[PDB]
Each structure stands twice: as structure tokens, then as C-alpha cells.
Amino acid sequence: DIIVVALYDYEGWWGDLSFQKGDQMVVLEESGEWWKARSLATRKEGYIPSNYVAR
Amino acid sequence: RPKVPLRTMSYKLAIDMSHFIKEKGGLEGIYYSARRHRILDIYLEKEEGIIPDWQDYTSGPGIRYPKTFGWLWKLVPVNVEDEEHYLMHPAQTSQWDDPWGEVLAWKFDPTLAYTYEAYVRYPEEF
């Protein structure tokens, strides 16, 4: 139940989770620097740049 | 906005990015060269965090198929310079970059999202 919040907008590619600054989402995997996440807004899953978010 | 962390090119990235490049009018019909291969590598590395290990093509004469499945940009020979000019001037055609001396051009082919032609045609090259 680690929850992160967007610090910048991210327009991603197929397989990424796109988000906007302030969006909060669950981290589903935190390995490496690209993470799996589910958006609290949409329940949509995808990969995100870890440097775009913070706990 | 910061740079995104580096990553390998998944086939989904390959398909999504190929269509995006296609739609924004890039690459189609442009002459292939080693320099331009590297320019492409560099652009996507420093713009999408793509490690430049995905852009490889099949060897023999004729059409060169991308060896990363999902990348939709193949190399098509064009029917059309001495070696000394090649050395001293930046001629931008694959005539001397290409081991088989063909002049290659980039062509968009979306069936490359459906058929892994490189793998099905040239398994030995993997």
C-alpha cells in the first residue's frame, strides 16, 4: 500500500501509465527506476518513471 | 520536466513509437546512413530514455527488416560516388556504409507489428 504522488505531468507510451502533476497512485512494483503503478483516479495500470514521483 | 530513467525498448514501445514517428512525418523515404542510424539512436536515447540497442537490421541484400519486433521502419533499397569522396565528405547515402553497397531508404511497414519478419526469415541472424 505504498502510495506516490505525481510531481510532474507524464505523457507515456503504450504500457506506461500516463499521469498529471498531483495525481496519486499505488506502486505495484518498485524494482529498478521504472515502476509498476495503478492510478487511484482510474484504476489503470502501467509503468512510470520513479523520478517523477515521491512518497 | 526531468528526463525519464533509461530503459530497453519493449515491443509495445516499438509499436507506439513507430506510429508516432510515422504520424509526425519522420523517416519515411529518407536515405539511410550510418550517421543517421546513430542520430536516431541518440534522439530516442536523450528523448525517451531508450538504450540504443534496439536498432538493428537484417543483413543480406534487399529489404532489411528490423530485428527488434514491433519497430515498424524497415530499409528498402533504392535504385540509383567513389570511395575517396566517401572518406572526405559526409555523403549521406548508404552506398559505402552498407556492406552490400545498396542505397537504402527508410520505409514504414505496419505489418511488422503482425509478423516478425526478421525472425521468421533470418533466424540465423539471432
Numbering used by the authors:
A (entry chain D): 80 to 94, 96 to 135
B (entry chain A): 103 to 182, 188 to 233
Give me lines lifted from the publication on this model.
Nef-mediated internalization of CD4 from the surface of infected cells is highly conserved among primate lentiviruses and thought to promote the release of fully infectious viral particles and to prevent superinfection. Nef stimulates clathrin-mediated endocytosis of CD3, CD4 and other cellular receptors by acting as an adapter of the adapter protein machinery. Our study thus provides insights into the molecular basis for the versatility of Nef as an adapter protein for the internalization of surface molecules containing endocytic sorting motifs.
The structure was determined by molecular replacement at 2.78 Å resolution with good stereochemistry. The asymmetric unit consists of two Nef/Hck heterodimers that assemble at the Nef–SH3 domain interface with the C-terminal flexible loop of Nef exposed in opposite directions. In this crystallographic assembly, the EEHYLM sorting motif of the C-terminal flexible loop interacts with the hydrophobic crevice formed by the two central helices α4 and α5 of Nef and the interconnecting loop. As observed for HIV-1 Nef and its myristoylated full length variant, SIVmac239 Nef eluted as monomer in size exclusion chromatography experiments or as heterodimer in complex with the SH3 domain.
